[PDB]
């Protein structure tokens, strides 16, 4: 970890009315160090052991930013907030000890190769507390993302709530939205391009304009590839303004239309607000 | 250094010392132009502002060995007079140039105004 | 010794191995094709997956039998590294330092001729369309490849 | 909010051939201001009221970046896109009014302490529109993250779709992947280290090599800690290439193997692509 | 795409003891270029065709960073890692070819207007591999986010696992937490402000202090707006330390309390750890 | 070298050059790579290690 | 199992196979050479007709043993696709503009306000004669390869 100073600014009351070289001799010291933090932030600080971030091999800025990789010896010291780190615990489980932070202080960290396991756990000390974490949090997750945020600093109390996320995967929802069931009492909604998912799961809520009749069902669908169909399973049915134990407040029908999985949601009731939300999906790729 | 120059040709005879031996250089882009009154330049603060037949070179001060001026153009100013505009006055924050009655001025800080895709550049 | 899937090689013998072996159902195989270790990895852009075995999703299975490879290659622009002339040239420039275009002659013809230089790039090798190819083939020898189908 | 200028660059045609001090006297003005945006971006702009981001107390760069905290008086003005903000509405509900943006323009904001409530809502005006939001969006969510992105700018029309996320939590999936059911017709998949979750929920889809036989079930599991078991609930069964109403196209079995929850997915059919995807999990921590 | 050099630093052994102008004449070249990467990172590189990032129109820093928009001709060349891009494939499907990366190398990309479709797909070549992706990944998703991360570089092998996310939506969980069932054997938990969701889905796990009795149910709720109620559907019941096939190890009751959906989780068993986790929600907005 | 013509032309054509070697494929950085691999097929090769 | 002409390869053993085998007359084979399936389809330019076995008229026998291929390749002009400068410049030019010196510049000042140019075809890499080659060898391993001569 190359240490950065804060911003360090030049005196313009210097220069043309004062000794040029000297006031500049100072200014470079700033400027040089000044960009260092910049490039050390968005590039490998191990590039300082190189030409000191200079040359074509020198530290470059990543619009994505860079997650600084280092030895454990450096993280053996409380590591400052605001930093992006990438460390892989394949070698061993580590503690990443973090300074007492401030409200809003962030700590971003990752294991890119996902070497983190129980055999390769990751311990963290953010001083005086981490919300939800008694003592030091341990991280066994491969391809996880360590993000700390200090939600209280106060006087002595650095309270870090904690977020962590799998660095990869398919996290999107193909279809989420809301509409009102037409005067025709139905519609057809393209859900996803028929090829995007073998499985999806969605939740539709059909609610009256006055909100009294609101329809809910548990939608589990099997996309049928060869037949260009989608097989549904509905259950756990719930209602409020239901006037009949039969299909009520609306109806849920499915289809594949225009290379889209297309749900057809029909309500005998006019002025029914239906929010179509696909909560989870699945598709099959290659083996392994 | 003394700077000796033809009115139209961007060709600059340089005179280092009380005139004995001189040199010249191109040193100017384009058509140093047609001042009436034989006063081309006004130095405003650090900036020696000279006319050009088409343009305006901005003041900012090679193998001959001693330092000099080289001026690119502040821009090609002239609106609709183009040439002539005999007179050149730059007070701090203001360029001032006039053909006939129209005086047309520029604010020179960092130039307050630039131009965009419409043709010329 | 030679179970199904066995590649046999005899060099000088054109005949079916079952002729000279007296055994097996033998079929010529991999002709003009080298034999490389198919990578068990799924990483190799080449020997990971079999181009030939694709799924419904057109996805290659994790198997040997992938095919491909090229004997020769012709060059295209995107492959060519950044290059430049070996001497300076008069460079069409909007903002440049080399001023020109002022002088009369034209009519009046009495004005002697200054040579009138225009505005574009100079093509290079515009006659190779496409250019001559280069071979991709490394030192080899042709051999009679026999897989035993049965 | 400390205002930044854009990049402002020095003339090198100056200096050694011109008056040194002057051309430099100008350059510092750039440079000083130039780093200001930088450090004001990645550090507290309230550090300008300090030594102006100078000194050790001065603004520092956060590889994570800094979410700028301010008064409402400043957000009482349309706030420029590209900015990271942290404001806590415990004091009061606020409007954050945003300039008309450009396609791709982002606005990042958070409440770190999560003081945002209905008692502490958050109003936003991004000029001329926010996609999905009629008028000004209000945010009552604690520990939320306000991220605006301008998905249309066009001429007058700044269209902001909107993303928001809980700043914390466990967002990872322990096991997601895909494979082909073996010539043995089954496999064992480590799902998570047996201790990672008390509950998980996953979705397996077993599809034939030719895709005609595709198996789907709704997998709800209870990890059994003391017995080192996992209790399953399967229902809502769906199929396509099913040749039998019994277990068909494949079978789903579970286990805990090698300190891993281990699902054993057995298909009598060879060449069955099975995508194992764990959609949701649960684990118990400490009380409170 | 404006090309950036790496960090390029000034010699202070120059200046006051050497020729001032010259050593500075060089330094500006650095400095100018040096900020260029900076502003080109966090602002439009098409602002270089402008006053070169200078002037008020010049490139500005985005604390959020900027996703660089360009022609395809530029992405027709392997595009370096670390870059944020925004391209909209409405014009046509594109390949974004990426250099061979390093472990930890990131590539961030978006389509802000979501013009990406199957008619507007997006192809990507990250050299030698992308984990899970045979050949070049294609992206048909509107409002997606292309994030590549190189999880192996090694010698020749640039292994890119891949994350992608819908640039927008409601991704938050209103209520997630854990507690121990009281000596009273129950509690009341505010889930969300009663108005936040028409639908929610949560998962509670009630586990004994010794972990032997652990209760699990599948919680599907319909928030009742007019009646200020919440309608539940429970099913797929699973247990471990259950001593009775009836309600066992705990009980799950619901309510709306203090403008909060409030679940009341009652366990006859003392010392029961209950983790309350709301996995999915739904609310209805305006039509369209 | 320049005239300037004289003042008052309708032909004041001027282009301002620069003088340098002329780059080519400066956008190819590096150029697009070329494959070295001749025709083939993939097989399972085995060494007898015992 | 090893008819004459059988190609045997032991990985590590340099010895004649008859040493560790006990049988056969073996010859080292295909050194610096890859084995590639010979084709009975004459259309295969390399691996169908045998270059080394020719008839009297030099028609390559259609037999195994065709050889060829190169370890590395040096590039040449015929291989170059259409190319031109990355900028606009002057290519004499004819029609154009360019000028001489009104005031008709004559002696000192000599160099300034004057430029000497020449006209020719601009060279790139003129000092690459030849350029540096690229290898044609794909990932390999050296191996002991014995053909059985008897």
Å from C61 to nearest chain G CA? 23
| CB-nearest partner of C43 from E76, E135, E159 | E159
Q: Rounded distance, CA A213 to CA A271, Å?
A: 10
Do residues D208 and D269 lie in contact, with contact meaning Cβ atoms separated by under 8 Å? yes
Q: Is A123 helix (H, G, I), strand (E, B) or coil?
A: strand
Q: Rounded distance, CA D120 to CA D142, Å?
A: 9
Q: Calculate the alpha carbon distances from D82 to B48, D37, D149, D163, E139 in Å.
A: 40, 12, 9, 15, 26
G104-117 in b/e form (b: 16+ CB < 10 A) is ebeeebeebbebee
| CB-nearest partner of C97 from B29, B31, B121 | B29
Q: Which residues pair with A238 in a beta bridge?
A: A216
**How, if at all, do strands E214-224 and E199-208 pair?**
antiparallel
Do residues C137 and G33 lie in contact, with contact meaning Cβ atoms separated by under 8 Å? no
Q: Rounded distance, CA D87 to CA D78, Å?
A: 15
| CB-nearest partner of G66 from C83, C100, C142 | C142
Q: Calculate the alpha carbon distances from B81 to B94, B104, D53 in Å.
A: 18, 9, 49
Environment class of G18 (CB within 10 Å of its CB; exposed 0-12, middle 13-18, buried 19+): middle
229-288 of A, contacting E, C-beta below 8 A: 235-240, 259, 273-275, 277, 279-280, 285-286
**How, if at all, do strands F23-24 and D229-239 pair?**
unpaired
**What subunits make at least 3 CB pairs under 8 angstroms with G?**
B, C, F
Helix A20-42 / helix E20-42 crossing angle, nearest 10 deg: 30
CA B1 to centroid of chain Cα atoms: 17
Do residues C140 and C31 lie in contact, with contact meaning Cβ atoms separated by under 8 Å? no
User: If phi over 0 gives left and psi between -120 and 50 gives alpha, with beta otherwise, what is residue D245?
Assistant: alpha
Residues of chain C contacting E76 with CB distance shorter than 8 Å: 78
Show the CA angle centred on residue D129, arms to residues D125 and D134, nearest 5°: 85
Residues of chain A contacting D68 with CB distance shorter than 8 Å: none
Å from F50 to nearest chain C CA? 15
| CB-nearest partner of A288 from C55, C57, C62 | C62
Phi, psi of A121 (to 5 degrees): -75, 175
Environment class of G41 (CB within 10 Å of its CB; exposed 0-12, middle 13-18, buried 19+): exposed
Between B and D, how many residue pairs show a Cβ–Cβ distance under 8 A?
21
Residues of chain C contacting B30 with CB distance shorter than 8 Å: 99
Å from G69 to nearest chain F CA? 10
E57: nearest CA partner in chain B:
B114
Contact D6 E54 (CB under 8 A): yes
E9 and chain A: CB distance < 8 Å anywhere? yes
Chain D meets chain A (3+ C-beta pairs below 8 A): yes
| CB-nearest partner of E39 from D6, D83, D163 | D6
Phi, psi of C82 (to 5 degrees): -55, 130
Q: Calculate the alpha carbon distances from G10 to C4, C53, G17, G142 in Å.
A: 22, 31, 8, 11
With helix as H, strand as E and coil as C, how does D219-273 read?
EEEEEECCCCEEEEEEEEEEECCCCCCCCCCCEEECCEECCEEEEEEECCCCCEE
Residues, chain A: 288
CA A88 to centroid of chain Cα atoms: 20
Å from F30 to nearest chain G CA? 15
Quick check: bond before G130 cis, omega within 30? yes
Nearest to E162 by CA among E225, E96, E117: E96
Q: Rounded distance, CA D10 to CA D27, Å?
A: 6
**How many C-beta atoms lie closer than 10 Å to residue D140's C-beta?**
18
Q: Calculate the alpha carbon distances from G97 to C90, C117, E112, G89 in Å.
A: 12, 5, 48, 13
Q: Rounded distance, CA D166 to CA B88, Å?
A: 64
Contact B13 G103 (CB under 8 A): no
Q: Which residues pair with D219 in a beta bridge?
A: D202, D234
Q: Rounded distance, CA E204 to CA A46, Å?
A: 46
Domains of chain A and any CATH numbers? 17-51 (1.20.5.960), 67-169 (2.60.120.640), 170-283 (2.60.40.1680)
Residues of chain G contacting B9 with CB distance shorter than 8 Å: 103, 113
Å from D182 to nearest chain C CA? 12
Q: Rounded distance, CA A142 to CA A118, Å?
A: 9
Contact D209 C55 (CB under 8 A): yes
Å from F6 to nearest chain C CA? 8
Q: Rounded distance, CA G49 to CA G64, Å?
A: 7
C54 and chain F: CB distance < 8 Å anywhere? no
Contact C56 A225 (CB under 8 A): yes
With helix as H, strand as E and coil as C, how does chain D read?
CCCCCCCCCCCCCCHHHCCHHHHHHHHHHHHHHHHHHHHHHHCCHHHCCCCCCCCCCCCCCCCCCCCECCCHHHHCCCECCCCEEECCCCCCCEEEEECCCCCCCEEEEECCCCCCCCCCCEEEEECCCECCECCCEECCCCCCEEEEEEEECCCCCCEEEEEECCCCEECCCCCEEEEEECCCCCCEEEEEECCCCCEEEEEEEEEECCCCCEEEEEEEEEEECCCCEEEEEEEEEEECCCCCCCCCCCEEECCEECCEEEEEEECCCCCEEEEEEEEEEECCCCCC
Do residues B108 and B87 lie in contact, with contact meaning Cβ atoms separated by under 8 Å? no
Phi, psi of A128 (to 5 degrees): 80, -20
B114 and chain E: CB distance < 8 Å anywhere? yes
Nearest to E244 by CA among E269, E280, E262, E270: E269
Between B and E, how many residue pairs show a Cβ–Cβ distance under 8 A?
5
In E43-148, alpha helices (H): 72-75
Contact C45 E159 (CB under 8 A): no
Could you write out the DSSP letters of every residue in E219-234? EEEEEETTTTEEEEEE
Element at E40 (helix H, strand E): helix E20-42
E51 and chain B: CB distance < 8 Å anywhere? yes
| CB-nearest partner of C143 from G64, G95, G137 | G64
Contact E53 D9 (CB under 8 A): yes
B116 and chain D: CB distance < 8 Å anywhere? no
**How, if at all, do strands D122-126 and D145-152 pair?**
unpaired
Do residues E129 and E106 lie in contact, with contact meaning Cβ atoms separated by under 8 Å? no
Q: Rounded distance, CA E151 to CA E162, Å?
A: 9
Do residues A33 and A14 lie in contact, with contact meaning Cβ atoms separated by under 8 Å? no
**What subunits make at least 3 CB pairs under 8 angstroms with F?**
B, C, E, G
Å from C22 to nearest chain F CA? 25
E3 and chain A: CB distance < 8 Å anywhere? no
43-62 of C, contacting D, C-beta below 8 A: 55-57
* Local structure of residue C51 (DSSP, 8 states): S
Q: Which residues pair with G135 in a beta bridge?
A: G72
Nearest to E135 by CA among E95, E165, E163, E101: E95
Residues, chain C: 150
Interface-testing mutation among D212, D270, D273, with chain C (most C C-beta atoms within 10 A): D273
**What subunits make at least 3 CB pairs under 8 angstroms with D?**
A, B, C, E
**How, if at all, do strands A106-110 and A84-86 pair?**
parallel
Quick check: bond before G93 cis, omega within 30? yes
Nearest to C34 by CA among G136, F41, G63, G49: F41
Residues of chain E contacting F29 with CB distance shorter than 8 Å: 77
Contact B8 F4 (CB under 8 A): yes
E161 and chain D: CB distance < 8 Å anywhere? no
Do residues D99 and D130 lie in contact, with contact meaning Cβ atoms separated by under 8 Å? no
Residues of chain D contacting C56 with CB distance shorter than 8 Å: 209-211
HSE-CB at E88 with a 13 A cutoff on CA atoms is 11
Residues of chain D contacting A232 with CB distance shorter than 8 Å: 238
Q: Rounded distance, CA E130 to CA E110, Å?
A: 18
Method: cryo-EM
Q: Rounded distance, CA B38 to CA B52, Å?
A: 13
Q: Calculate the alpha carbon distances from G86 to C89, C93, D273, F22, G89 in Å.
A: 13, 13, 51, 7, 10
Q: Is C79 helix (H, G, I), strand (E, B) or coil?
A: helix
Phi, psi of G79 (to 5 degrees): -85, 0
HSE-CB at E137 with a 13 A cutoff on CA atoms is 23
Do residues C29 and C146 lie in contact, with contact meaning Cβ atoms separated by under 8 Å? yes
Q: Which residues pair with G37 in a beta bridge?
A: C31, C143
**How many C-beta atoms lie closer than 10 Å to residue G74's C-beta?**
13
- In angstroms and rounded to an integer, the radius of gyration of the C-alpha atoms of chain D is 28
Residues, chain B: 121
Residues of chain G contacting C119 with CB distance shorter than 8 Å: 88
Q: Rounded distance, CA E220 to CA A234, Å?
A: 13
Do residues D82 and D111 lie in contact, with contact meaning Cβ atoms separated by under 8 Å? no
Q: Is E36 helix (H, G, I), strand (E, B) or coil?
A: helix
G87 and chain F: CB distance < 8 Å anywhere? yes
E219: nearest CA partner in chain D:
D220
Element at E38 (helix H, strand E): helix E20-42
Q: Rounded distance, CA D77 to CA E68, Å?
A: 27
Contact B83 F4 (CB under 8 A): no
**What subunits make at least 3 CB pairs under 8 angstroms with E?**
A, B, C, D, F
Å from G113 to nearest chain B CA? 4
Q: Rounded distance, CA A53 to CA E19, Å?
A: 25
Contact C74 G79 (CB under 8 A): yes
């Amino acid at each position: 970890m190359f240490i950065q100073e804060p911003k360090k600014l030049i005196d313009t009351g210097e220069i043309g009315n004062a000794s040029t070289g000297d006031i500049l001799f100072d200014g470079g010291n700033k400027i040089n160090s000044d960009f260092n933090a910049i490039y050390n932030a968005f590039g490998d600080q191990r590039k300082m052991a190189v030409a000191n971030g200079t040359g074509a091999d020198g530290q470059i800025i990543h619009a994505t930013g860079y997650y600084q990789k280092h030895s454990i010896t450096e993280y053996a010291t409380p590591v400052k907030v605001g930093t992006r780190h990438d460390i892989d615990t394949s070698t061993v489980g580590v503690k990443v000890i973090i300074e007492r932070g401030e409200l809003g202080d962030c700590v971003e960290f990752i294991n890119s190769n996902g070497s983190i396991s129980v055999t390769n756990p990751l311990t963290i000390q953010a001083i005086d507390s981490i919300k939800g974490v008694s003592g030091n949090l341990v991280v066994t997750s491969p391809y996880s993302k360590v993000t700390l945020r200090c939600i209280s600093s106060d006087n002595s109390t650095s309270v870090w709530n904690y977020s962590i996320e799998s660095m990869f995967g398919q996290k999107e929802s193909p279809a989420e939205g809301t509409w009102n069931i037409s005067t025709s009492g139905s519609v057809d909604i393209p859900l996803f391009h028929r090829t995007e998912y073998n499985m999806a799961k969605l939740l539709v809520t059909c609610q009256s304009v006055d909100g009294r009749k609101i329809k809910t069902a548990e939608i589990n669908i099997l996309v049928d590839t060869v037949n260009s169909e989608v097989i549904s399973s509905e259950y756990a049915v719930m209602r409020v303004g239901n006037e009949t134990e039969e299909d009520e407040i609306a109806n849920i029908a499915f289809s594949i239309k225009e290379n889209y999985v297309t749900a057809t949601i029909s309500s005998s009731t006019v002025g029914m607000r239906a929010a179509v939300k696909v909560i989870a999906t699945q598709k099959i790729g290659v083996a392994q | 250094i003394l700077y000796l120059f033809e009115r139209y040709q961007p060709v600059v005879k340089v005179s280092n010392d009380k005139g004995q031996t001189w040199k010249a250089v191109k040193l100017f882009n384009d058509r140093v132009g047609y001042p009436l009154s034989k006063t081309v330049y006004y130095q405003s603060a650090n900036t020696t502002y000279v006319l050009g037949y088409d343009k305006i070179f901005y003041g900012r001060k090679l193998h001959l060995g001693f330092d000099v001026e080289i001026f690119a153009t502040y821009a090609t100013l002239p609106a609709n007079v183009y040439r002539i505009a005999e007179a050149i006055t730059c007070t701090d924050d203001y360029i001032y140039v006039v053909a006939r009655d129209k005086v047309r001025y520029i604010k020179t800080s960092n130039a307050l105004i630039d131009f965009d895709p419409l043709s010329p550049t | 010794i030679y179970p199904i899937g066995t590649i046999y090689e005899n060099a000088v013998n054109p005949n079916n191995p079952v002729t000279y072996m007296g055994f097996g159902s033998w079929k010529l195989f991999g002709q003009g094709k080298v034999l490389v270790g198919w990578n068990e990895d799924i990483s190799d852009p080449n020997f990971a997956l079999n181009n030939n075995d694709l799924d419904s999703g057109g996805n290659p299975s994790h198997t040997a039998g992938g095919t491909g490879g090229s004997t020769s290659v012709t060059l295209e622009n995107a492959n060519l590294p950044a290059t430049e002339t070996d001497e300076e040239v008069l460079i069409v420039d909007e903002n440049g330092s080399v001023i020109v275009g002022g002088c009369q002659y034209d009519p009046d013809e009495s004005g002697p001729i200054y040579t009138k230089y225009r505005e574009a790039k100079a093509s290079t090798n515009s006659t190779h369309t496409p250019p001559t190819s280069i071979t991709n083939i490394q030192p080899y020898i042709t051999v009679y490849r026999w897989i035993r189908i049965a």
